[PDB]
Amino acid sequence: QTILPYPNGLYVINKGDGYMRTNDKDLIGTLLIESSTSGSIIQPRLRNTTRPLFNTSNPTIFSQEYTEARLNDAFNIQLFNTSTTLFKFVEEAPTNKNISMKVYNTYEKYELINYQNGNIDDKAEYYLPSLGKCEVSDAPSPQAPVVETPVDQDGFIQTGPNENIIVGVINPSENIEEISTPIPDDYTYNIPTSIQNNACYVLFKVNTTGVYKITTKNNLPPLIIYEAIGSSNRNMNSNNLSNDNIKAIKYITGLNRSDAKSYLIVSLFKDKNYYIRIPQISSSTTSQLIFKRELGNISDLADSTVNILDNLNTSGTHYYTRQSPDVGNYISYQLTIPGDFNNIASSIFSFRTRNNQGIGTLYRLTESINGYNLITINNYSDLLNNVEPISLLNGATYIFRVKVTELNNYNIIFDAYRNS
């Protein structure tokens, strides 16, 4: 029951090597090696056939073939039920003692999940045949007392090193748009009509490395941005995006919650390819993706969703529930303080989180003609349920950045309290 700090979608998780079934069900055999002798067990691949094992919670959709296609999207696994990779174990027994050499087949465990609203809706487990395990130990006494033991529970145990590597994959039932020309400092993309029928991805790259603000017009719906994993180095064209069909995607920032009006501040690099996932928009008016290069210290928000907070004219509680960033990553909130701008402060504000702990930085967002600038007002060591009040100027725009320090819940709750 770990929390997965990721947006909705498909994920393939390598849960490690050295998996095998209980009750010696993957035992190849045991050699008794006498002192001063060597023994060997070989998998020589005289036949190439291997026997993968497979489970699914949804046989119709998450079929073995489907799961395999995702394993290929994620890790580029070519061969599932064959191998030309031999493995071999060699053990020389010391002059004093005899040795037992026990060898097993093993598997690498991959997990395909359909992740929706912080929940795993469907789960497939694929066990890729692997290169074995060898246990050497002192040879047992053949006169050792025979203990009557019951066969233990039927399942898997892991004998390899701890591993948990998550790779998101493009949802293949969602279509991919492409901006062929690498985008300049300012670009507006018209979202096609197909968006009315399902979510889509849009593949693009930037002409110049820098920080970019990305948003829909009116800042709705929320967006999600990913890196294509392994796109760097490889084929390139000066005036063209080189599509190399990489379906392995690394989540940067963004969320699914339909009411999270927001924009994204992200550091983007020339050599990489990116994907933006635009959710389904049932509206009949044409939506847009707006890109805007940002110079200046707005870069402090480096990879974050900026949640725009509204209707806080009322006093007291103002809760905003959003998908939590992972430990170490940012979530940000923009406030424009009610009232006209002279130099009076509005009924003091107090900022706290309610599920996850975080550090937090209050900025004053200026509008001085060089792009935007941020002036640091204060920092807070702890955000959760404890915080000091502060007065903010009327009609001024402030941004509050949270850096997550403990992930107790899938959602982080933000409270902009207007006390007096």
Partner: protein, 177 residues
């Protein structure tokens, strides 16, 4: 041309019914010790013997009984323990090696090892019926130093009764719980 003794000792601490039991790996069978042949070396030579044992040489040995036929033994063993039929389709190799000592001769011989499965019927104390299955596992070498004048014990060359070269096991599963 030999044998041991057994009066009793078939007590099993479990309830009435039928059980499939893994009796362990490393079993060798009577009178087939030297069927694969042996190997002779001398004076610091390393001798190696091995086998890439496939489906057509991995012969199981069934010893069925009134209420436990071969198919019954096979299915209950392969359901709970390793599926040896499937495994037999994938060649596995094993080999042993030993260096002959200086100025002496070494003799080495190979035989197959087995996993022993039993299917037992019990009445709250003792086994009333037992079927046995030997599944081919791997192999095992005995070696000895020798000269032409030396007599060797019969028990080196010849096993008259099935035994386990490792510790015997008793890992059970109630069938039709």
């Amino acid at each position: 041309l030999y044998y041991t003794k057994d009066k009793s000792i078939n007590n099993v601490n479990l309830a009435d019914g039928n059980y499939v039991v893994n009796r362990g790996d490393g079993w060798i069978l009577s009178r087939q010790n030297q069927n694969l042949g042996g190997n002779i070396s001398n004076n610091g030579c390393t001798a190696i013997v091995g086998d890439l044992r496939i489906r057509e040489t991995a012969t199981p040995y069934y010893y069925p009984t009134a209420s436990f036929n071969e198919e019954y033994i096979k299915n209950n063993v392969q359901n709970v323990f390793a599926n040896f039929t499937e495994a037999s389709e994938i060649p596995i190799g094993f080999e042993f090696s030993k260096t002959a000592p200086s100025n002496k001769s070494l003799y080495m011989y190979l035989q197959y090892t087995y996993i022993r499965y039993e299917i037992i019927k019990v009445l709250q104390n003792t086994v009333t019926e037992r079927a046995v299955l030997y599944v081919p596992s791997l192999g095992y070498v005995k070696s000895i130093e020798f000269n032409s004048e030396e007599q060797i014990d019969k028990n080196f060359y010849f096993t008259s009764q099935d035994k386990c070269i490792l510790n015997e096991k008793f890992i059970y599963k109630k069938i039709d719980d």
